[PDB]
Design a protein around this ligand. Sequence first.
Ligand code: EMC
Ligand code: EMC
Ligand code: NA
Ligand code: NA
Lengths: 176, 180
Amino acid sequence: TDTDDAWRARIAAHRADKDEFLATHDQSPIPPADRGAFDGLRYFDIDASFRVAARYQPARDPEAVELETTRGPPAEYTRAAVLGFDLGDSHHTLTAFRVEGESSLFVPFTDETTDDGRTYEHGRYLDVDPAGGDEVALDFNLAYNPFCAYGGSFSCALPPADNHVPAAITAGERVD
Amino acid sequence: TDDAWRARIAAHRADKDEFLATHDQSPIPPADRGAFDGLRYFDIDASFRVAARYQPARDPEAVELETTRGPPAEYTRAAVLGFDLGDSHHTLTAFRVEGESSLFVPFTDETTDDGRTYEHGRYLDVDPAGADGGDEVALDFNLAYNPFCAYGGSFSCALPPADNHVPAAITAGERVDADL
Ligand code: EMC
Ligand code: EMC
Ligand code: NA
Ligand code: NA
Protein backbone atom coordinates (compact mmCIF):
# COMPACT_ATOMS: atom_id res chain seq x y z
CA THR A 1 0.00 0.00 0.00
CA ASP A 2 2.59 2.57 1.14
CA THR A 3 3.44 5.09 -1.58
CA ASP A 4 6.76 6.94 -1.69
CA ASP A 5 4.87 10.17 -1.23
CA ALA A 6 3.14 8.79 1.87
CA TRP A 7 6.49 7.78 3.35
CA ARG A 8 8.20 11.07 2.59
CA ALA A 9 5.16 12.90 4.03
CA ARG A 10 5.26 10.80 7.19
CA ILE A 11 8.97 11.69 7.66
CA ALA A 12 8.31 15.36 6.95
CA ALA A 13 5.43 15.48 9.39
CA HIS A 14 7.57 13.84 12.07
CA ARG A 15 10.51 16.24 11.70
CA ALA A 16 8.15 19.24 11.83
CA ASP A 17 6.22 18.07 14.90
CA LYS A 18 9.52 17.28 16.62
CA ASP A 19 10.88 20.77 15.83
CA GLU A 20 7.69 22.26 17.32
CA PHE A 21 8.02 20.27 20.57
CA LEU A 22 11.73 21.15 20.91
CA ALA A 23 11.14 24.83 20.16
CA THR A 24 8.13 25.47 22.43
CA HIS A 25 7.44 22.72 24.96
CA ASP A 26 8.43 22.85 28.64
CA GLN A 27 9.80 19.30 28.60
CA SER A 28 11.89 20.06 25.47
CA PRO A 29 15.49 18.84 25.70
CA ILE A 30 16.60 22.22 24.25
CA PRO A 31 17.75 24.30 27.24
CA PRO A 32 15.28 27.15 27.95
CA ALA A 33 18.10 29.63 27.33
CA ASP A 34 18.54 28.40 23.78
CA ARG A 35 14.91 27.81 22.84
CA GLY A 36 14.23 31.30 21.50
CA ALA A 37 17.11 31.05 19.05
CA PHE A 38 16.19 27.49 18.05
CA ASP A 39 15.80 27.15 14.30
CA GLY A 40 14.87 23.49 13.89
CA LEU A 41 16.90 20.31 13.75
CA ARG A 42 19.25 19.70 10.82
CA TYR A 43 18.68 16.68 8.58
CA PHE A 44 20.15 15.01 5.56
CA ASP A 45 17.55 15.08 2.81
CA ILE A 46 15.37 11.98 2.58
CA ASP A 47 17.07 9.13 0.70
CA ALA A 48 15.58 5.73 -0.10
CA SER A 49 18.94 4.04 -0.43
CA PHE A 50 19.12 4.36 3.34
CA ARG A 51 15.74 2.76 3.90
CA VAL A 52 16.77 -0.90 3.92
CA ALA A 53 15.45 -4.33 4.87
CA ALA A 54 17.30 -5.99 7.72
CA ARG A 55 17.46 -9.68 8.49
CA TYR A 56 16.33 -10.18 12.10
CA GLN A 57 18.46 -12.67 14.04
CA PRO A 58 17.06 -12.83 17.59
CA ALA A 59 19.38 -13.52 20.52
CA ARG A 60 19.09 -17.23 21.34
CA ASP A 61 19.35 -16.53 25.05
CA PRO A 62 18.73 -12.82 25.65
CA GLU A 63 21.49 -11.46 27.78
CA ALA A 64 21.68 -8.67 30.33
CA VAL A 65 24.23 -6.16 29.04
CA GLU A 66 25.32 -2.61 29.78
CA LEU A 67 26.32 0.41 27.76
CA GLU A 68 28.38 3.29 29.01
CA THR A 69 26.48 6.54 29.46
CA THR A 70 27.79 10.05 28.94
CA ARG A 71 27.47 11.26 32.54
CA GLY A 72 26.38 8.35 34.65
CA PRO A 73 26.39 4.70 35.68
CA PRO A 74 26.13 2.21 32.81
CA ALA A 75 22.61 1.71 31.55
CA GLU A 76 21.15 -1.80 31.54
CA TYR A 77 19.78 -3.37 28.40
CA THR A 78 18.99 -6.83 27.16
CA ARG A 79 20.78 -7.89 23.99
CA ALA A 80 17.75 -8.69 21.86
CA ALA A 81 18.96 -9.40 18.33
CA VAL A 82 21.35 -8.94 15.49
CA LEU A 83 20.14 -6.83 12.56
CA GLY A 84 21.83 -7.78 9.29
CA PHE A 85 21.63 -5.52 6.25
CA ASP A 86 23.24 -4.10 3.11
CA LEU A 87 24.27 -0.55 2.40
CA GLY A 88 25.09 -0.30 -1.27
CA ASP A 89 27.60 -3.05 -1.91
CA SER A 90 28.50 -3.95 1.70
CA HIS A 91 26.93 -6.13 4.41
CA HIS A 92 26.65 -4.89 8.00
CA THR A 93 25.36 -6.00 11.40
CA LEU A 94 24.02 -4.04 14.31
CA THR A 95 23.09 -5.25 17.77
CA ALA A 96 19.54 -4.33 18.82
CA PHE A 97 18.71 -3.84 22.50
CA ARG A 98 15.50 -4.47 24.40
CA VAL A 99 14.60 -1.64 26.79
CA GLU A 100 12.33 -2.22 29.83
CA GLY A 101 8.77 -1.04 29.15
CA GLU A 102 9.45 0.01 25.56
CA SER A 103 8.10 -2.04 22.67
CA SER A 104 10.65 -0.94 20.01
CA LEU A 105 14.24 -2.15 19.97
CA PHE A 106 16.93 0.41 20.76
CA VAL A 107 19.74 0.51 18.17
CA PRO A 108 22.47 3.07 18.96
CA PHE A 109 25.10 3.37 16.23
CA THR A 110 27.97 5.37 14.83
CA ASP A 111 29.14 5.58 11.23
CA GLU A 112 31.59 7.43 9.02
CA THR A 113 29.58 10.66 9.46
CA THR A 114 30.29 10.30 13.16
CA ASP A 115 33.97 10.26 12.31
CA ASP A 116 34.06 13.11 9.81
CA GLY A 117 31.92 15.36 12.02
CA ARG A 118 28.76 15.55 9.91
CA THR A 119 26.66 13.83 12.61
CA TYR A 120 26.72 13.79 16.42
CA GLU A 121 30.06 12.85 17.94
CA HIS A 122 28.66 10.25 20.36
CA GLY A 123 26.60 8.68 17.62
CA ARG A 124 22.93 8.32 16.77
CA TYR A 125 19.91 6.25 17.71
CA LEU A 126 17.45 4.26 15.66
CA ASP A 127 14.23 2.65 16.92
CA VAL A 128 13.24 -0.63 15.30
CA ASP A 129 9.82 -2.35 15.55
CA PRO A 130 10.52 -6.03 16.29
CA ALA A 131 6.96 -7.19 15.61
CA GLY A 132 6.67 -9.95 15.33
CA GLY A 133 12.11 -13.43 13.40
CA ASP A 134 12.31 -12.69 9.66
CA GLU A 135 12.89 -9.23 8.16
CA VAL A 136 12.42 -5.81 9.77
CA ALA A 137 12.62 -2.28 8.43
CA LEU A 138 15.77 -0.25 8.99
CA ASP A 139 15.17 3.35 7.95
CA PHE A 140 18.20 5.50 8.69
CA ASN A 141 16.19 8.54 7.55
CA LEU A 142 14.77 8.17 11.07
CA ALA A 143 18.12 8.21 12.85
CA TYR A 144 17.95 10.85 15.60
CA ASN A 145 20.30 12.39 18.18
CA PRO A 146 20.59 11.61 21.91
CA PHE A 147 19.19 14.38 24.19
CA CYS A 148 22.65 15.45 25.34
CA ALA A 149 23.37 16.63 21.78
CA TYR A 150 21.33 19.75 22.50
CA GLY A 151 23.35 21.27 25.34
CA GLY A 152 21.44 20.07 28.38
CA SER A 153 22.92 17.77 30.99
CA PHE A 154 21.42 14.40 30.15
CA SER A 155 23.08 11.05 30.70
CA CYS A 156 22.54 9.07 27.49
CA ALA A 157 23.48 5.56 26.41
CA LEU A 158 26.60 5.29 24.22
CA PRO A 159 26.75 2.99 21.17
CA PRO A 160 28.94 -0.08 21.68
CA ALA A 161 32.09 -0.23 19.48
CA ASP A 162 30.53 -3.20 17.67
CA ASN A 163 27.70 -0.95 16.43
CA HIS A 164 29.93 1.18 14.24
CA VAL A 165 28.88 0.91 10.61
CA PRO A 166 31.92 1.44 8.35
CA ALA A 167 29.97 3.59 5.89
CA ALA A 168 28.65 7.11 5.47
CA ILE A 169 25.04 7.06 6.59
CA THR A 170 23.91 10.28 4.90
CA ALA A 171 20.34 10.04 6.17
CA GLY A 172 18.55 11.11 9.31
CA GLU A 173 19.56 13.85 11.69
CA ARG A 174 22.82 15.75 11.22
CA VAL A 175 24.62 18.54 13.11
CA ASP A 176 25.31 21.78 11.21
CA THR B 1 66.68 35.10 41.27
CA ASP B 2 64.46 35.06 38.22
CA ASP B 3 67.22 32.95 36.73
CA ALA B 4 66.84 30.00 39.10
CA TRP B 5 63.08 30.31 38.69
CA ARG B 6 63.29 30.47 34.86
CA ALA B 7 65.74 27.56 34.82
CA ARG B 8 63.54 25.39 37.01
CA ILE B 9 60.52 26.09 34.81
CA ALA B 10 62.53 25.39 31.67
CA ALA B 11 63.83 22.18 33.25
CA HIS B 12 60.30 21.09 34.10
CA ARG B 13 59.02 21.65 30.54
CA ALA B 14 61.97 19.67 29.10
CA ASP B 15 61.57 16.68 31.45
CA LYS B 16 57.82 16.72 30.75
CA ASP B 17 58.35 16.64 26.96
CA GLU B 18 60.80 13.75 27.52
CA PHE B 19 58.15 11.83 29.52
CA LEU B 20 55.36 12.50 27.03
CA ALA B 21 57.58 11.60 24.10
CA THR B 22 59.02 8.31 25.32
CA HIS B 23 57.25 6.92 28.37
CA ASP B 24 54.73 4.05 28.16
CA GLN B 25 52.45 5.89 30.56
CA SER B 26 52.49 9.08 28.45
CA PRO B 27 49.06 10.65 27.89
CA ILE B 28 50.14 11.11 24.22
CA PRO B 29 48.36 8.27 22.37
CA PRO B 30 50.92 5.67 21.20
CA ALA B 31 49.97 6.39 17.58
CA ASP B 32 51.23 9.98 17.83
CA ARG B 33 54.28 9.59 20.05
CA GLY B 34 56.74 9.35 17.17
CA ALA B 35 55.39 12.48 15.51
CA PHE B 36 55.21 14.30 18.88
CA ASP B 37 57.31 17.44 18.90
CA GLY B 38 56.89 18.74 22.44
CA LEU B 39 54.18 20.77 24.17
CA ARG B 40 53.66 24.45 23.28
CA TYR B 41 54.14 27.26 25.78
CA PHE B 42 54.05 31.03 26.06
CA ASP B 43 57.42 32.45 27.04
CA ILE B 44 58.17 32.70 30.76
CA ASP B 45 56.74 36.03 31.91
CA ALA B 46 57.19 37.14 35.54
CA SER B 47 54.15 39.42 35.33
CA PHE B 48 52.07 36.25 35.44
CA ARG B 49 53.66 35.03 38.64
CA VAL B 50 51.42 36.75 41.13
CA ALA B 51 50.94 36.86 44.87
CA ALA B 52 47.50 35.56 45.79
CA ARG B 53 45.53 36.18 48.96
CA TYR B 54 44.54 32.83 50.47
CA GLN B 55 40.96 32.85 51.80
CA PRO B 56 40.18 29.37 53.11
CA ALA B 57 36.64 28.01 53.09
CA ARG B 58 35.16 28.49 56.54
CA ASP B 59 33.36 25.17 56.26
CA PRO B 60 34.87 23.25 53.31
CA GLU B 61 32.08 21.62 51.31
CA ALA B 62 31.92 18.60 49.04
CA VAL B 63 31.26 19.91 45.54
CA GLU B 64 31.24 18.40 42.05
CA LEU B 65 32.85 19.47 38.79
CA GLU B 66 31.63 18.35 35.40
CA THR B 67 34.01 16.01 33.59
CA THR B 68 34.74 15.50 29.88
CA ARG B 69 33.49 11.87 30.10
CA GLY B 70 31.70 9.86 32.77
CA PRO B 71 30.14 11.15 36.03
CA PRO B 72 30.99 14.44 37.79
CA ALA B 73 34.21 14.52 39.79
CA GLU B 74 34.08 15.01 43.54
CA TYR B 75 36.24 17.62 45.24
CA THR B 76 36.19 19.73 48.39
CA ARG B 77 35.94 23.51 48.05
CA ALA B 78 38.96 24.56 50.04
CA ALA B 79 39.64 28.24 49.44
CA VAL B 80 39.32 31.37 47.37
CA LEU B 81 42.47 32.79 45.84
CA GLY B 82 42.28 36.54 45.25
CA PHE B 83 44.88 38.26 43.10
CA ASP B 84 45.52 41.03 40.55
CA LEU B 85 46.01 40.78 36.77
CA GLY B 86 47.34 43.20 36.15
CA ASP B 87 45.38 46.33 36.92
CA SER B 88 42.33 44.24 37.77
CA HIS B 89 41.34 42.02 40.73
CA HIS B 90 40.19 38.42 40.35
CA THR B 91 39.20 35.40 42.44
CA LEU B 92 39.57 31.69 41.77
CA THR B 93 38.17 28.81 43.78
CA ALA B 94 40.74 26.19 44.82
CA PHE B 95 39.82 22.54 45.35
CA ARG B 96 41.20 19.95 47.72
CA VAL B 97 41.63 16.54 46.08
CA GLU B 98 41.77 13.33 48.09
CA GLY B 99 45.32 12.13 48.65
CA GLU B 100 47.00 15.10 46.97
CA SER B 101 48.70 17.76 49.03
CA SER B 102 48.42 20.58 46.44
CA LEU B 103 45.19 22.43 45.78
CA PHE B 104 43.62 21.96 42.35
CA VAL B 105 42.76 25.22 40.51
CA PRO B 106 41.11 24.58 37.12
CA PHE B 107 40.40 27.80 35.24
CA THR B 108 39.65 29.50 31.95
CA ASP B 109 40.64 32.88 30.58
CA GLU B 110 40.39 34.97 27.43
CA THR B 111 43.02 32.77 25.75
CA THR B 112 40.50 29.98 26.16
CA ASP B 113 37.91 32.05 24.33
CA ASP B 114 40.17 33.25 21.51
CA GLY B 115 41.54 29.77 20.95
CA ARG B 116 45.18 30.32 21.94
CA THR B 117 45.01 27.90 24.90
CA TYR B 118 43.01 24.69 25.35
CA GLU B 119 39.24 24.87 24.78
CA HIS B 120 38.28 23.16 28.03
CA GLY B 121 40.55 25.37 30.12
CA ARG B 122 43.79 24.84 32.01
CA TYR B 123 44.89 23.53 35.40
CA LEU B 124 47.08 25.05 38.07
CA ASP B 125 48.47 23.39 41.20
CA VAL B 126 48.81 25.60 44.25
CA ASP B 127 50.64 24.72 47.45
CA PRO B 128 48.39 25.79 50.34
CA ALA B 129 50.73 24.94 53.19
CA GLY B 130 50.83 26.48 55.51
CA ALA B 131 48.91 29.66 54.77
CA ASP B 132 46.15 31.24 56.87
CA GLY B 133 43.70 33.98 55.85
CA GLY B 134 44.87 36.09 54.44
CA ASP B 135 48.44 34.96 53.93
CA GLU B 136 49.72 35.01 50.37
CA VAL B 137 50.33 32.01 48.13
CA ALA B 138 52.21 32.08 44.83
CA LEU B 139 49.95 31.82 41.79
CA ASP B 140 52.27 31.23 38.82
CA PHE B 141 50.35 30.99 35.57
CA ASN B 142 53.62 30.07 33.83
CA LEU B 143 52.92 26.67 35.43
CA ALA B 144 49.42 26.39 33.97
CA TYR B 145 49.10 23.07 32.14
CA ASN B 146 46.60 21.16 30.01
CA PRO B 147 44.17 18.39 31.06
CA PHE B 148 45.13 14.97 29.65
CA CYS B 149 42.32 15.02 27.10
CA ALA B 150 44.02 17.91 25.28
CA TYR B 151 46.33 15.32 23.80
CA GLY B 152 43.62 13.20 22.17
CA GLY B 153 43.29 10.31 24.60
CA SER B 154 39.77 9.55 25.82
CA PHE B 155 40.36 10.60 29.43
CA SER B 156 37.91 11.88 32.02
CA CYS B 157 39.13 15.31 33.16
CA ALA B 158 37.45 17.85 35.42
CA LEU B 159 36.07 20.99 33.74
CA PRO B 160 36.70 24.41 35.39
CA PRO B 161 33.64 25.87 37.11
CA ALA B 162 32.07 28.97 35.51
CA ASP B 163 33.29 31.30 38.26
CA ASN B 164 36.87 30.21 37.58
CA HIS B 165 36.92 32.21 34.38
CA VAL B 166 39.53 34.96 34.51
CA PRO B 167 38.48 37.90 32.23
CA ALA B 168 41.99 38.45 30.90
CA ALA B 169 44.43 37.03 28.37
CA ILE B 170 46.68 34.85 30.48
CA THR B 171 49.60 34.58 28.04
CA ALA B 172 51.67 32.29 30.25
CA GLY B 173 52.01 28.56 30.70
CA GLU B 174 50.92 25.89 28.26
CA ARG B 175 49.26 26.80 24.96
CA VAL B 176 47.89 24.87 21.98
CA ASP B 177 48.23 25.11 18.19
CA ALA B 178 44.68 25.62 16.89
CA ASP B 179 45.65 24.65 13.35
CA LEU B 180 46.30 21.06 14.46
C1 EMC C 1 18.64 10.38 24.52
C2 EMC C 1 18.31 9.68 25.82
HG1 EMC C 1 19.22 10.67 27.34
C1 EMC D 1 44.10 15.79 33.51
C2 EMC D 1 43.24 14.84 34.34
HG1 EMC D 1 42.34 13.49 33.12
NA1 NA E 1 17.27 11.02 22.18
NA1 NA F 1 46.59 17.12 33.35
